[PDB]
Amino acid sequence: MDYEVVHDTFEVNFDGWCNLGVDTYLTAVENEGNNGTRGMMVINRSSASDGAYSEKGFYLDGGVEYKYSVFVKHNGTGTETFKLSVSYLDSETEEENKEVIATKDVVAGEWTEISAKYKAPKTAVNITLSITTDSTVDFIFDDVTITRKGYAANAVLKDMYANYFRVGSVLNSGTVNNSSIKALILREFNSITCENEMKPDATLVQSGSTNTNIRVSLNRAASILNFCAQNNIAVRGHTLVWHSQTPQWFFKDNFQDNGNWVSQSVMDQRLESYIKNMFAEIQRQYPSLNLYAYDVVNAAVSDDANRTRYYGGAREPGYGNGRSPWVQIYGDNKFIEKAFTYARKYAPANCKLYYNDYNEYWDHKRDCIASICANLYNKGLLDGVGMQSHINADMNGFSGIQNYKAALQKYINIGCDVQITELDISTENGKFSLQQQADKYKAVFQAAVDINRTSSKGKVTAVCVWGPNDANTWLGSQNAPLLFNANNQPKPAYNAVASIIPQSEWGDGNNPA
Ligand SMILES: O[C@@H]1[C@@H](O)[C@H](O[C@@H]2CO[C@@H](O[C@@H]3CO[C@@H](O)[C@H](O)[C@H]3O)[C@H](O)[C@H]2O)OC[C@H]1O
Ligand SMILES: [Ca+2]
Numbered sequence: 181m182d183y184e185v186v187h188d189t190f191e192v193n194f195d196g197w198c199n200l201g202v203d204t205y206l207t208a209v210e211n212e213g214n215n216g217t218r219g220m221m222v223i224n225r226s227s228a229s230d231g232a233y234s235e236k237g238f239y240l241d242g243g244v245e246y247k248y249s250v251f252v253k254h255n256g257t258g259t260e261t262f263k264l265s266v267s268y269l270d271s272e273t274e275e276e277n278k279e280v281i282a283t284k285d286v287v288a289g290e291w292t293e294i295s296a297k298y299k300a301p302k303t304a305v306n307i308t309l310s311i312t313t314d315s316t317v318d319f320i321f322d323d324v325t326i327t328r329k330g331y332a333a334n335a336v337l338k339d340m341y342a343n344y345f346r347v348g349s350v351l352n353s354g355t356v357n358n359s360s361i362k363a364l365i366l367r368e369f370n371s372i373t374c375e376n377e378m379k380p381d382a383t384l385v386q387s388g389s390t391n392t393n394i395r396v397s398l399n400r401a402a403s404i405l406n407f408c409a410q411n412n413i414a415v416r417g418h419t420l421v422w423h424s425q426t427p428q429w430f431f432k433d434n435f436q437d438n439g440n441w442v443s444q445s446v447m448d449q450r451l452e453s454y455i456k457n458m459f460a461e462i463q464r465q466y467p468s469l470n471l472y473a474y475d476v477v478n479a480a481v482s483d484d485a486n487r488t489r490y491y492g493g494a495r496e497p498g499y500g501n502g503r504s505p506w507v508q509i510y511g512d513n514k515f516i517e518k519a520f521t522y523a524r525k526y527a528p529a530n531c532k533l534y535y536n537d538y539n540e541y542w543d544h545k546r547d548c549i550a551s552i553c554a555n556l557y558n559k560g561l562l563d564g565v566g567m568q569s570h571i572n573a574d575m576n577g578f579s580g581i582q583n584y585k586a587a588l589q590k591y592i593n594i595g596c597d598v599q600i601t602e603l604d605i606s607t608e609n610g611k612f613s614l615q616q617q618a619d620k621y622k623a624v625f626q627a628a629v630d631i632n633r634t635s636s637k638g639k640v641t642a643v644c645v646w647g648p649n650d651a652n653t654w655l656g657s658q659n660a661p662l663l664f665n666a667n668n669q670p671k672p673a674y675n676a677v678a679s680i681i682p683q684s685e686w687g688d689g690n691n692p693a
Contacts, residue, residue: 181247182327182328182329182330183327183328185246185327187326190220191217192409193467194206194402196234196406198402199399200230201227201230204225209320212320213323215291219253219320219322220321222320226316234310234402236308237305239326240307242271242307245329246298247328247329248266248326249294250264250294252319254288255288256315256317256318258287263283264281264309264310265278266278266307267307268300268307268308269305269306272303282294305357335678339686340678343687343692344628344693345632345641349369349372350374350644350647351372352377353377360668361649361652362407370692371414372408372413375646375647375654378417379422379425381427382401383398386427386435393453394450394454397461398462398466406466414470414472415469415470415471416642417473419476419536420519422480423505444509447509447510455526463528472530472642473532474527474532475534475535476519476533476534477516477535479537480516481537482545485544488548489544493513493548516556533564534563535553535564536565536566541579541584541586546590553596564597565591565594565599566600566602567591570646571604571620571624572605572607573612573619574620593638596638598638600643601644602646604645604647606659610658618671619676622679624643628640646661651665651666663677
């Protein structure tokens with residue numbers, strides 16, 4: 181058992197560990213760790229199955245044997261039976277099986293090692309270590325260890341663009357288990373956004389929320405944040421307010437999907453609380469994470485010209501289908517400035533606040549987004565406009581290079597920054613070739629680089645692609661819309677984008693400027 185694949189020694193961050201059981205609480209405390217170090221306390225359990233867990237899919241493969249080892253300590257009376265358990269999901273049967281791998285009776289007051297060798301089936305993905313007891317006893321663990329068993333800049337995006345902006349991609353619960361993508365991200369990208377795991381419905385906790393204390397959870401995001409903090413990859417938060425992927429109950433008097441719409445002043449409380457508590461938890465659990473940007477409000481301007489003309493861009497009130505529960509409560513887009521105010525209040529200083537939207541180069545919508553953002557920038561509330569940049573491969577037309585530069589320029593002319601937040605470039609089911617997609621990718625990065633070489637005030641501080649490869653895109657792979665194919669081989673677009681910056685100007689991707 182040579183290689184060490186995991187070593188969690190909670191000195192800085194929670195290292196990807198979550199509370200098992202909706203009411204269990206994890207708290208990392210100084211000096212309560214093994215050897216006087218920082219340790220991880222698990223409290224408030226209410227059944228032998230409650231406890232703590234960590235998805236380690238990033239680090240553990242199916243069909244491989246590992247030695248799993250954790251030091252634990254409890255402060256009760258007599259012996260406690262500790263259990264280490266491993267869970268996976270069978271990529272065939274789609275069932276979660278959890279087998280207890282080590283059972284060990286542990287005396288009070290003493291740091292003890294619990295460990296065993298375990299080899300999960302060849303078809304196991306999402307391998308998850310969890311610690312529990314045979315009682316509902318409180319405990320503390322430290323020094324989790326899993327083992328087996330067998331500046332010159334590189335030609336990589338983050339290094340090539342180190343003097344210009346971060347270069348981002350996206351991770352999700354599924355891709356976080358893909359070894360091959362882990363290697364890709366580490367090699368190329370210095371920014372990650374969670375595709376879904378930081379949205380309101382992935383983070384809000386219904387049980388026990390109240391108007392002035394909305395409970396939140398990073399359990400869905402934790403392996404990602406952990407992976408990013410551990411490897412010095414910056415993260416964009418996505419997203420605090422959005423008419424989509426937000427539970428209806430969040431908007432209802434009794435925290436139930438079918439309650440009554442709440443008043444504006446009730447919803448102010450809940451809005452502020454969600455925002456305060458999201459920032460508090462990120463700080464609490466991943467203080468070393470470079471949370472460089474956050475999408476405070478997402479996609480609030482309507483695609484409908486009638487609404488941008490006569491209703492300040494408000495979507496239609498309601499829930500689902502592009503309707504907005506925010507407009508349902510507030511009547512209006514006034515909630516936007518509210519969200520940025522609370523975000524300015526609780527975000528770290530280095531965390532830049534973005535209004536993010538798509539079809540951002542369509543005149544009537546562009547004009548409305550630019551106006552909203554300029555008013556916010558001027559009040560000190562907003563730092564940047566996010567251009568989602570869900571575009572196609574056509575140099576001409578609705579998202580062609582002209583419309584796109586015009587929008588990039590009008591955003592930059594506000595004085596704020598710009599980020600290109602969710603870039604993908606659809607071939608429209610093969611209507612456009614990979615060679616034309618390469619041209620559009622080259623045009624877009626080239627336009628960002630040009631802004632940065634020109635002026636001044638405004639900059640493009642990130643360019644991010646909405647996915648790591650063509651096997652993992654929300655547009656479906658028939659639109660092959662990213663820089664790497666389904667085997668992570670670089671496409672023509674990658675070659676193209678890698679050819680814009682001369683070797684002399686490359687810098688340190690881990691310390692971009
Ligand atoms: O059924 C749910 C899926 O539909 C959901 O898929 C995600 C939908 O949101 C996508 O990302 C957005 C794309 O558009 C921009 O306007 C937004 O700012 C982005 O958030 C995301 O890529 C999809 O994966 O997730 C899984 C299901 O529960
Ligand atoms: Ca420790």
